[PDB]
Amino acid sequence: WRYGGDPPWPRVSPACAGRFQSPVDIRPQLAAFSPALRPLELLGFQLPPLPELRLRNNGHSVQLTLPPGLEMALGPGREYRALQLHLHWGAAGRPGSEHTVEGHRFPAEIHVVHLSTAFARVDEALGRPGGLAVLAAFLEEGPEENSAYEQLLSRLEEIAEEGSETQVPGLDISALLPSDFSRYFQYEGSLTTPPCAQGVIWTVFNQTVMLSAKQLHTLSDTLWGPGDSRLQLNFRATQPLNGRVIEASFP
């Protein structure tokens, strides 16, 4: 499968034609305020430099594979382990976030993919209710260099080639997310890539994270993808809610 065109994703995986897909357009004035939604809690996300982490250009994104021991709770009894993080972005003068807010597409988006502690593997959790949880944050252009993201963006040149990987030092993975873990949207959806399996709990932060204009150009302008094309515009079209309600942790 590719961004850009064929083969149609439903030919790759039937679930890509499911009723309840991601990403979606968030209309905050339409979200349901759900006081049950408590602040997210993260344990083990402040990694030491060793062991190193694998950073791979898989031709679809840049993916940082995370080690065991990164724990995330959506709430009491809603426990997950971090697997990996990756990014979605656009191209020069073209934003590339997957989620939109009132139709606004942000420059880029980070996903941290988590597996429920009730499942040993991703393939057993696919299509199961709450089997996977994704933490998603918008990346916006700011005046300051982001020193957290620089640790990864300074390595993109080494993995310019599709199917390339390098080893990078451990870093504070939580420093790639917003500081406010109390204000977020939550809804049930799918993988945004084949096989597009449903039952994913999506948490989208209210607060965005700021990268510099040059950091965002590095992200969109360094990696190469399938055929002989730049890895850019690696985002899926917004999918209809089809009756799903988006919840908000805040009034």
Added chain:
Amino acid sequence: WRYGGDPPWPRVSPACAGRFQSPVDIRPQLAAFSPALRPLELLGFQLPPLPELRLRNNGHSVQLTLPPGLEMALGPGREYRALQLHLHWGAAGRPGSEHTVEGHRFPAEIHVVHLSTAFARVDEALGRPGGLAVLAAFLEEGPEENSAYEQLLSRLEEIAEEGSETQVPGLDISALLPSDFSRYFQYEGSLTTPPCAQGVIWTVFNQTVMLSAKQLHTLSDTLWGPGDSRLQLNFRATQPLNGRVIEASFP
């Protein structure tokens, strides 16, 4: 294992000592109104007179085996199939509901146990979030003989002895439940019997159903359990919420 005695349930099943157990005490005061909670959808519950259904005294309860085709949804793409129903009740002058409201125990409680249709088998669903869902309603004393419950209560005689069973004509299962499918409490917990697996979505109807004083007497005074003892007070003590917030489908 048995009710009020030995062995200690955590000796039979350590899962009984989990932190997110059922049943719980509901404080409607402290429940979070979640506007996303839609009316319950129950299709295929109006069974024809034949085939007949197995009703069994298993020594812990009276359990009705439900046939294939009873489909239930808690929300978009969150679908279930009904397996069985059973009851919890007290004794002469003593209430025996499992759930309580502001400390009040109701005479009795009905449980309709469902399997997520994301799982081909019950054994895959046990311990997985949302694998099982129970619809719970409190039974109260009314002035009128309940027609629905009469079909089951009139047959308790035939199965008074622990382990005995009888075939009963098909009935409308939906008629055992309360009037308003839009008004309920929901939280995540456990089986209330060993092995006390967690991941169970509990939906407790705001509204009660009414049985005659006589009907409640028949329920609590016809069945015999383990040893030579009456099958009575077959409920578990309420369990701490341990940070879980009970949600309400209604303001």
